[PDB]
Design a binder for these strands. Sequence first.
DNA 1: CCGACAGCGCATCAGC
DNA 2: GCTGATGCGC
DNA 3: GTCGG
Length: 326
Amino acid sequence: TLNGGITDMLTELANFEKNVSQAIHKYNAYRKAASVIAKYPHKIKSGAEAKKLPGVGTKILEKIDEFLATGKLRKLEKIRQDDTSSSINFLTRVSGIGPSAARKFVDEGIKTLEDLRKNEDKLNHHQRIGLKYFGDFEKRIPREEMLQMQDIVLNEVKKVDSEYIATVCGSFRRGAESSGDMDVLLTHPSFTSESTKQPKLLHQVVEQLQKVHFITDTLSKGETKFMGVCQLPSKNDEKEYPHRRIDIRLIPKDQYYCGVLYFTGSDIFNKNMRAHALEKGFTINEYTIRPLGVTGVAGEPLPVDSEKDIFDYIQWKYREPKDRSE
DNA sequence: CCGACAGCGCATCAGC
DNA sequence: GCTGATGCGC
DNA sequence: GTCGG
Ligand SMILES: Cc1cn([C@H]2C[C@H](O)[C@@H](COP(=O)(O)OP(=O)(O)[C@@](F)(Cl)P(=O)(O)O)O2)c(=O)[nH]c1=O
Ligand SMILES: [Mg+2]
Ligand code: NA
Ligand code: NA
Ligand code: NA
């Protein structure tokens, strides 16, 4: 974090535009600028120097000049004093409350943690569980706990059916020393792009993890994506571990490499890589890479035998997961 | 100048 | 109930 | 908010 003050400023601007202004493109522009500045290997000395990077334009360069000269940004100092903006920003920190619900609650006089606590009947199920674990979901997960969680998930999945493969993705797979949640990619030979020979493939795993009291709550659940809450077991007289977010994604087994590329991220890396694919005339999702015809219509899926094959198609040198943390 | 900005699963609601 | 739009979060 | 054409 040679440039942590600047990237913090840009992230706070991004959050303002997303949560308060509901200007999703300004939000993505600011996160793109923070990302490229975060990886720039020199302490930025001027907005001019920063404007040389792709994604920093005239407006952000001027903000950086103000921040360098004074250590702050008047625009943000004013946002911080504004009650409505501060209230809306805070409410979106609850899982399942986004910009729209945050403004609806604030318009109703529901502005603080206790207001939510006293109006639990105005929350949907996701939001209710988000509020329940508000503190826990602020806490990062040390990699050592991620390794215990992996061992549980892998062993419990193996007990349901030895032909499942579970892969922990997200920031853990990129080598991070701490993660915000646990992302699990799941495959089974019964579920391919050709057929689903077995029902309840995801449910079976979730059920086993609930049985052993690892999964404690559900945020949403369908046939291929589970989002919920889990907890490591603690020892006698030991304080309990925080509850943790867990996402499980069941992907057709023959589409594993597109799925593991997607679920490894980062999100910004995925955005960069998918944008580059579009420029090269391909489209990449978590299932396939397909060519784009002269009309923009996605073609037929291309053969994929490794993560590197996806990079080769779009003429990118291969990047290890540890180098995808944008 | 200005069109595009990655891609999608699940929850919820509205219109029928 | 279906279908399509919107919210939210990977 | 930024950028390619
Ligand atoms: C949020 C998001 C995620 N993804 C992919 C890429 C992420 O790496 C993967 C997991 O989503 P997370 O939000 O858990 O991201 P993460 O990289 O694991 C993380 F670093 Cl933000 P954390 O460790 O906090 O979960 O889903 C996207 O493609 N687009 C997205 O908008
Ligand atoms: Mg994650
Ligand atoms: Na630039
Ligand atoms: Na939220
Ligand atoms: Na996640």
